[PDB]
Design an enzyme around this catalytic site. Structure first.
Site, PDB file in Angstrom:
ATOM      1  N   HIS A 260      35.558  66.410  47.826  1.00 42.64           N
ATOM      2  CA  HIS A 260      34.160  66.106  47.640  1.00 42.64           C
ATOM      3  C   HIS A 260      33.857  65.403  48.950  1.00 42.64           C
ATOM      4  N   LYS A 261      33.501  66.219  49.940  1.00 42.50           N
ATOM      5  CA  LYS A 261      33.175  65.738  51.270  1.00 42.50           C
ATOM      6  C   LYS A 261      32.219  64.538  51.161  1.00 42.50           C
ATOM      7  N   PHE A 262      31.236  64.627  50.258  1.00 48.75           N
ATOM      8  CA  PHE A 262      30.263  63.559  50.058  1.00 48.75           C
ATOM      9  C   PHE A 262      30.762  62.439  49.159  1.00 48.75           C
ATOM     10  N   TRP A 263      31.062  62.763  47.914  1.00 44.54           N
ATOM     11  CA  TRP A 263      31.480  61.730  46.997  1.00 44.54           C
ATOM     12  C   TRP A 263      32.632  60.848  47.407  1.00 44.54           C
TER      13      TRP A 263
ATOM     14  N   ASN B 147      18.789  60.290  36.300  1.00 44.22           N
ATOM     15  CA  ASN B 147      18.608  61.534  35.583  1.00 44.22           C
ATOM     16  C   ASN B 147      17.484  62.287  36.244  1.00 44.22           C
ATOM     17  N   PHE B 148      17.475  63.594  36.050  1.00 42.79           N
ATOM     18  CA  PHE B 148      16.492  64.529  36.585  1.00 42.79           C
ATOM     19  C   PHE B 148      16.708  64.979  38.021  1.00 42.79           C
ATOM     20  N   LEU B 149      17.946  64.960  38.470  1.00 42.61           N
ATOM     21  CA  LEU B 149      18.283  65.442  39.796  1.00 42.61           C
ATOM     22  C   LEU B 149      18.117  66.952  39.722  1.00 42.61           C
TER      23      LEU B 149
ATOM     24  N   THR C 298      24.972  60.621  33.953  1.00 42.54           N
ATOM     25  CA  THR C 298      25.816  61.564  33.230  1.00 42.54           C
ATOM     26  C   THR C 298      25.544  62.897  33.858  1.00 42.54           C
TER      27      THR C 298
ATOM     28  N   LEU D 131      18.900  61.004  27.848  1.00 48.85           N
ATOM     29  CA  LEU D 131      17.803  61.899  27.504  1.00 48.85           C
ATOM     30  C   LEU D 131      17.907  63.199  28.343  1.00 48.85           C
TER      31      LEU D 131
HETATM   32  C1  LIG Z   1      22.928  51.839  42.098  1.00 47.50           C
HETATM   33  C2  LIG Z   1      22.011  52.893  42.699  1.00 47.50           C
HETATM   34  C3  LIG Z   1      22.645  54.269  42.862  1.00 47.50           C
HETATM   35  C4  LIG Z   1      22.084  55.285  41.886  1.00 47.50           C
HETATM   36  C5  LIG Z   1      22.701  56.676  42.014  1.00 47.50           C
HETATM   37  C6  LIG Z   1      23.905  56.934  41.075  1.00 47.50           C
HETATM   38  C7  LIG Z   1      24.416  58.361  41.134  1.00 47.50           C
HETATM   39  C8  LIG Z   1      23.288  59.378  40.930  1.00 47.50           C
HETATM   40  C9  LIG Z   1      23.646  60.817  41.338  1.00 47.50           C
HETATM   41  C10 LIG Z   1      23.915  61.719  40.131  1.00 47.50           C
HETATM   42  C11 LIG Z   1      22.657  62.388  39.556  1.00 47.50           C
HETATM   43  C12 LIG Z   1      22.935  63.206  38.286  1.00 47.50           C
HETATM   44  C13 LIG Z   1      22.231  62.605  37.085  1.00 47.50           C
HETATM   45  C14 LIG Z   1      21.387  63.598  36.373  1.00 47.50           C
HETATM   46  O1  LIG Z   1      20.291  63.842  36.798  1.00 47.50           O
HETATM   47  C15 LIG Z   1      21.883  64.319  35.141  1.00 47.50           C
HETATM   48  S1  LIG Z   1      22.752  65.883  35.459  1.00 47.50           S
HETATM   49  C16 LIG Z   1      21.385  66.937  35.899  1.00 47.50           C
HETATM   50  C17 LIG Z   1      21.681  67.640  37.211  1.00 47.50           C
HETATM   51  N1  LIG Z   1      20.687  68.682  37.341  1.00 47.50           N
HETATM   52  C18 LIG Z   1      20.966  69.946  37.469  1.00 47.50           C
HETATM   53  O2  LIG Z   1      22.101  70.377  37.509  1.00 47.50           O
HETATM   54  C19 LIG Z   1      19.745  70.894  37.560  1.00 47.50           C
HETATM   55  C20 LIG Z   1      20.005  72.278  38.234  1.00 47.50           C
HETATM   56  N2  LIG Z   1      20.854  72.111  39.371  1.00 47.50           N
HETATM   57  C21 LIG Z   1      20.419  71.713  40.532  1.00 47.50           C
HETATM   58  O3  LIG Z   1      19.233  71.443  40.801  1.00 47.50           O
HETATM   59  C22 LIG Z   1      21.508  71.553  41.567  1.00 47.50           C
HETATM   60  O4  LIG Z   1      21.045  72.248  42.696  1.00 47.50           O
HETATM   61  C23 LIG Z   1      21.872  70.063  41.910  1.00 47.50           C
HETATM   62  C24 LIG Z   1      20.637  69.255  42.394  1.00 47.50           C
HETATM   63  C25 LIG Z   1      22.477  69.344  40.681  1.00 47.50           C
HETATM   64  C26 LIG Z   1      22.920  70.080  43.018  1.00 47.50           C
HETATM   65  O5  LIG Z   1      22.402  70.648  44.232  1.00 47.50           O
HETATM   66  P1  LIG Z   1      23.128  71.861  44.973  1.00 47.50           P
HETATM   67  O6  LIG Z   1      23.713  72.872  43.902  1.00 47.50           O
HETATM   68  O7  LIG Z   1      22.096  72.591  45.930  1.00 47.50           O
HETATM   69  O8  LIG Z   1      24.334  71.285  45.796  1.00 47.50           O
HETATM   70  P2  LIG Z   1      24.075  70.448  47.136  1.00 47.50           P
HETATM   71  O9  LIG Z   1      24.529  71.372  48.385  1.00 47.50           O
HETATM   72  O10 LIG Z   1      22.519  70.001  47.278  1.00 47.50           O
HETATM   73  O11 LIG Z   1      25.007  69.176  47.109  1.00 47.50           O
HETATM   74  C27 LIG Z   1      26.344  69.332  46.801  1.00 47.50           C
HETATM   75  C28 LIG Z   1      26.933  67.962  46.704  1.00 47.50           C
HETATM   76  O12 LIG Z   1      26.254  67.153  45.698  1.00 47.50           O
HETATM   77  C29 LIG Z   1      27.086  67.100  44.509  1.00 47.50           C
HETATM   78  N3  LIG Z   1      26.451  67.308  43.206  1.00 47.50           N
HETATM   79  C30 LIG Z   1      26.000  68.445  42.591  1.00 47.50           C
HETATM   80  N4  LIG Z   1      25.442  68.416  41.333  1.00 47.50           N
HETATM   81  C31 LIG Z   1      25.559  67.063  41.118  1.00 47.50           C
HETATM   82  C32 LIG Z   1      25.176  66.247  39.964  1.00 47.50           C
HETATM   83  N5  LIG Z   1      24.568  66.812  38.816  1.00 47.50           N
HETATM   84  N6  LIG Z   1      25.384  64.946  39.973  1.00 47.50           N
HETATM   85  C33 LIG Z   1      25.952  64.381  41.031  1.00 47.50           C
HETATM   86  N7  LIG Z   1      26.357  64.945  42.144  1.00 47.50           N
HETATM   87  C34 LIG Z   1      26.173  66.380  42.244  1.00 47.50           C
HETATM   88  C35 LIG Z   1      28.293  68.041  44.768  1.00 47.50           C
HETATM   89  O13 LIG Z   1      29.459  67.582  44.080  1.00 47.50           O
HETATM   90  C36 LIG Z   1      28.399  68.002  46.266  1.00 47.50           C
HETATM   91  O14 LIG Z   1      29.038  66.841  46.729  1.00 47.50           O
HETATM   92  P3  LIG Z   1      30.563  66.780  47.106  1.00 47.50           P
HETATM   93  O15 LIG Z   1      30.730  67.476  48.589  1.00 47.50           O
HETATM   94  O16 LIG Z   1      31.001  65.258  47.129  1.00 47.50           O
HETATM   95  O17 LIG Z   1      31.478  67.551  46.000  1.00 47.50           O
HETATM   96  C1  LIG Z   2      21.353  63.691  30.874  1.00 44.16           C
HETATM   97  C2  LIG Z   2      21.031  65.141  30.476  1.00 44.16           C
HETATM   98  N1  LIG Z   2      20.187  65.489  29.423  1.00 44.16           N
HETATM   99  C3  LIG Z   2      20.132  66.877  29.358  1.00 44.16           C
HETATM  100  C4  LIG Z   2      20.952  67.411  30.384  1.00 44.16           C
HETATM  101  N2  LIG Z   2      21.521  66.340  31.090  1.00 44.16           N
HETATM  102  C5  LIG Z   2      22.464  66.408  32.261  1.00 44.16           C
HETATM  103  C6  LIG Z   2      22.986  67.825  32.658  1.00 44.16           C
HETATM  104  C7  LIG Z   2      24.525  67.993  32.314  1.00 44.16           C
HETATM  105  C8  LIG Z   2      24.541  68.004  30.811  1.00 44.16           C
HETATM  106  C9  LIG Z   2      24.230  69.406  30.243  1.00 44.16           C
HETATM  107  C10 LIG Z   2      24.164  70.610  31.034  1.00 44.16           C
HETATM  108  C11 LIG Z   2      23.765  71.827  30.405  1.00 44.16           C
HETATM  109  C12 LIG Z   2      23.406  71.804  29.006  1.00 44.16           C
HETATM  110  C13 LIG Z   2      22.970  73.085  28.251  1.00 44.16           C
HETATM  111  C14 LIG Z   2      24.056  73.373  27.310  1.00 44.16           C
HETATM  112  O1  LIG Z   2      25.192  73.015  27.580  1.00 44.16           O
HETATM  113  N3  LIG Z   2      23.836  74.013  26.232  1.00 44.16           N
HETATM  114  C15 LIG Z   2      24.988  74.278  25.339  1.00 44.16           C
HETATM  115  C16 LIG Z   2      25.440  72.891  24.716  1.00 44.16           C
HETATM  116  O2  LIG Z   2      26.739  72.863  24.116  1.00 44.16           O
HETATM  117  C17 LIG Z   2      24.551  75.159  24.254  1.00 44.16           C
HETATM  118  O3  LIG Z   2      23.410  75.494  24.142  1.00 44.16           O
HETATM  119  N4  LIG Z   2      25.455  75.590  23.436  1.00 44.16           N
HETATM  120  C18 LIG Z   2      25.097  76.483  22.368  1.00 44.16           C
HETATM  121  C19 LIG Z   2      24.426  77.798  22.904  1.00 44.16           C
HETATM  122  C20 LIG Z   2      25.114  78.435  24.108  1.00 44.16           C
HETATM  123  C21 LIG Z   2      25.180  79.942  24.038  1.00 44.16           C
HETATM  124  C22 LIG Z   2      25.314  80.539  25.435  1.00 44.16           C
HETATM  125  N5  LIG Z   2      26.663  80.251  25.912  1.00 44.16           N
HETATM  126  C23 LIG Z   2      26.265  76.829  21.507  1.00 44.16           C
HETATM  127  O4  LIG Z   2      27.441  76.384  21.700  1.00 44.16           O
HETATM  128  N6  LIG Z   2      25.906  77.602  20.500  1.00 44.16           N
HETATM  129  C24 LIG Z   2      26.823  78.004  19.480  1.00 44.16           C
HETATM  130  C25 LIG Z   2      26.449  76.986  18.414  1.00 44.16           C
HETATM  131  C26 LIG Z   2      26.929  77.373  17.037  1.00 44.16           C
HETATM  132  C27 LIG Z   2      28.283  76.649  16.728  1.00 44.16           C
HETATM  133  C28 LIG Z   2      28.734  77.042  15.329  1.00 44.16           C
HETATM  134  C29 LIG Z   2      27.650  76.588  14.322  1.00 44.16           C
HETATM  135  C30 LIG Z   2      26.316  77.344  14.608  1.00 44.16           C
HETATM  136  C31 LIG Z   2      25.827  76.969  16.014  1.00 44.16           C
HETATM  137  C32 LIG Z   2      23.468  70.583  28.261  1.00 44.16           C
HETATM  138  C33 LIG Z   2      23.865  69.422  28.872  1.00 44.16           C
END
Ligand SMILES: CCCCCCCCCCCCCC(=O)CSCCNC(=O)CCNC(=O)[C@@H](O)C(C)(C)COP(=O)(O)OP(=O)(O)OC[C@H]1O[C@@H](n2cnc3c(N)ncnc32)[C@H](O)[C@@H]1OP(=O)(O)O
Ligand SMILES: Cc1nccn1CCCCc1ccc(CC(=O)N[C@@H](CO)C(=O)N[C@@H](CCCCN)C(=O)NCCC2CCCCC2)cc1
Length: 422
Positions: A5-8, A136-138, A172, A422
């Site tokens: 994890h070049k960044f983390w 949350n909401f990244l 999370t 949430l």
């Molecule tokens: C005290 C103050 C400090 C407060 C800050 C604390 C930490 C906050 C950061 C965490 C935020 C997550 C929380 C949530 O929002 C819930 S989880 C909801 C998360 N949302 C989604 O998944 C929605 C759809 N996905 C996207 O939009 C995603 O695009 C993306 C934004 C999650 C990631 O962007 P990306 O795919 O373009 O990759 P990148 O090239 O921009 O960056 C990569 C680097 O960031 C890390 N990377 C990729 N996904 C990641 C993720 N979900 N969380 C963290 N790091 C991630 C990787 O490990 C990596 O780094 P490395 O080189 O080290 O391996």
């Molecule tokens: C902080 C936060 N809130 C919301 C999201 N996030 C952070 C993002 C990372 C957490 C995350 C990522 C992606 C998901 C979507 C997701 O995982 N959905 C799965 C959750 O387990 C789901 O829908 N599972 C269903 C449908 C998936 C089908 C497609 N593969 C499943 O297992 N269904 C079968 C259920 C069945 C079990 C037997 C009884 C009858 C119901 C949830 C949470």
């Protein structure tokens, strides 16, 4: 693997190997005077942005951004549908700031193409108060993935929060990263089994027929509990004191003031049934001493790919609390453990009746808290997705999210995790 994890690998977070003895901060103390007042750099094509939730075309920009580029299931057929309302609840808790609703608009056109968010909270790591922020909401636009824009958004939201003198965060994520303090699994109590089936949320287990499954998952049209009523302001204190008491039980929780509680559990009155976000309930006994409390919120799926349906109604079981076990024992001791169970198994069941009645096609929960007592019993099936909790800048002793090593609900030893994102 922290090295890959070049960044983390540069962040104040626990590690994969590292076992801990003394939970505490990871960085040598800092102070706001130590932090830069200048927002970080981003390619000339883009400019930072701050989102005022109370602005209507700004909320709109975000709601759209996430609505089309946010989190999907592992097979991409469903995506989270966070409504403007939902944002209005989650992004404006007490203490929120617009400076922590960071956006990233492309300068030439202004199209919002990235978001990251922080609202302040005070944690309770093993009972040790810890002033943090909750992240949350990244989200980065689909066409902007992998440009490693994320570490910037983090580096930037971290910076702003340090400037307010906070240095710790709870976040999370699904993917695995450095210090999972704990882990949990989503589960699913079907409310509309046939529809879930008709949109591939589930399949048909062999030896079964839709009727079988449809009957197997049937739910009473009216809750089965006396005292079962929906929370009001008047209750807060007893409730809040009740919740406070109950949650005492877990190694990792949020330490809600009373205000950043009421808001969390009673949403804007205006909103109609099909809009409402939080559903909070309580059980007022004859003498009044309300004894029961639980909540849940609504967060649908955009069913991508389906002609039979376009939306999935989902109700996520939120926070809850009950006096059963404790007035009984000291240890979560057997005769008391099962004492809770039956009371729990009775609450949530009404949660499922309640949720179903509000038009939720499936009812979800996490194997965190004491979820494990009622899940299996109440027919909550194993989801295919999991959730990892993490702590930014803090050594925490691994806590429990109800999973035996075979990702089975650990019915015996429940869950130390008390928060519910949430
Ligand atoms: C005290 C103050 C400090 C407060 C800050 C604390 C930490 C906050 C950061 C965490 C935020 C997550 C929380 C949530 O929002 C819930 S989880 C909801 C998360 N949302 C989604 O998944 C929605 C759809 N996905 C996207 O939009 C995603 O695009 C993306 C934004 C999650 C990631 O962007 P990306 O795919 O373009 O990759 P990148 O090239 O921009 O960056 C990569 C680097 O960031 C890390 N990377 C990729 N996904 C990641 C993720 N979900 N969380 C963290 N790091 C991630 C990787 O490990 C990596 O780094 P490395 O080189 O080290 O391996
Ligand atoms: C902080 C936060 N809130 C919301 C999201 N996030 C952070 C993002 C990372 C957490 C995350 C990522 C992606 C998901 C979507 C997701 O995982 N959905 C799965 C959750 O387990 C789901 O829908 N599972 C269903 C449908 C998936 C089908 C497609 N593969 C499943 O297992 N269904 C079968 C259920 C069945 C079990 C037997 C009884 C009858 C119901 C949830 C949470």
């Amino acid at each position: 693997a922290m090295k890959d994890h070049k960044f983390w690998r540069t962040q104040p977070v626990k590690d994969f190997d590292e076992k801990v003895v003394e939970e505490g901060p990871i960085d040598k103390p800092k102070t706001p005077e130590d932090i830069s007042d200048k927002p970080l750099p981003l390619l000339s094509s883009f400019e930072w942005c701050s989102i005022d939730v109370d602005n209507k075309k700004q909320l709109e920009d975000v709601f759209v951004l996430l609505n089309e580029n946010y989190v999907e299931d592992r097979d991409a057929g469903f995506r989270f549908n966070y409504t403007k309302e939902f944002f209005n609840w989650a992004l404006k808790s007490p203490g929120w700031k617009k400076d922590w609703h960071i956006g990233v608009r492309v300068k030439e056109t202004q199209k919002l193409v990235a978001f990251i968010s922080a609202i302040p909270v005070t944690l309770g790591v093993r009972g040790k108060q810890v002033p943090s922020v909750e992240i949350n909401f990244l989200c980065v636009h689909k066409q902007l993935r992998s440009k490693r824009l994320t570490p910037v958004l983090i580096k930037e939201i971290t910076r702003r929060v340090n400037k307010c003198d906070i240095w710790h965060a709870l976040y999370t994520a699904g993917i695995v990263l450095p210090a999972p303090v704990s882990t949990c699994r989503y589960t699913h109590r079907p409310l509309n089994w046939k529809k879930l089936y008709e949109v591939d949320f589930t399949g048909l287990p062999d030896g079964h027929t839709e009727e079988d499954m449809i009957a197997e998952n049937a739910l009473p049209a009216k809750t089965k509990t006396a005292g079962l009523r929906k929370l009001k302001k008047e209750d807060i204190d007893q409730v809040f004191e009740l919740f406070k008491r109950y949650q005492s039980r877990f190694e990792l929780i949020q330490i809600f003031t009373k205000e950043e509680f009421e808001h969390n559990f009673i949403g804007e009155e205006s909103l109609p049934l099909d809009k409402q976000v939080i559903f909070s309930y309580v059980v007022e006994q004859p003498d009044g001493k309300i004894t029961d409390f639980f909540s849940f919120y609504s967060l649908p799926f955009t069913i991508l790919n389906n002609t039979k349906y376009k939306d999935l109604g989902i109700g996520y079981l939120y926070y809850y609390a009950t006096d059963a076990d404790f007035q009984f024992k000291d240890r979560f001791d057997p005769k008391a453990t099962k004492a809770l169970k039956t009371r729990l198994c009775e609450l949530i069941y009404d949660a499922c009746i309640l949720a179903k009645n509000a038009n939720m096609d499936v009812f979800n929960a996490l194997t965190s808290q004491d979820n494990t007592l009622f899940l299996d019993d109440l027919k909550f099936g194993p989801g295919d997705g999991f959730l990892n909790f993490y702590l930014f800048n803090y050594r925490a002793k691994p806590i429990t999210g109800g999973l035996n090593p075979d990702n089975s609900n650990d019915i015996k030893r429940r869950s130390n995790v008390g928060v519910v994102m949430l």
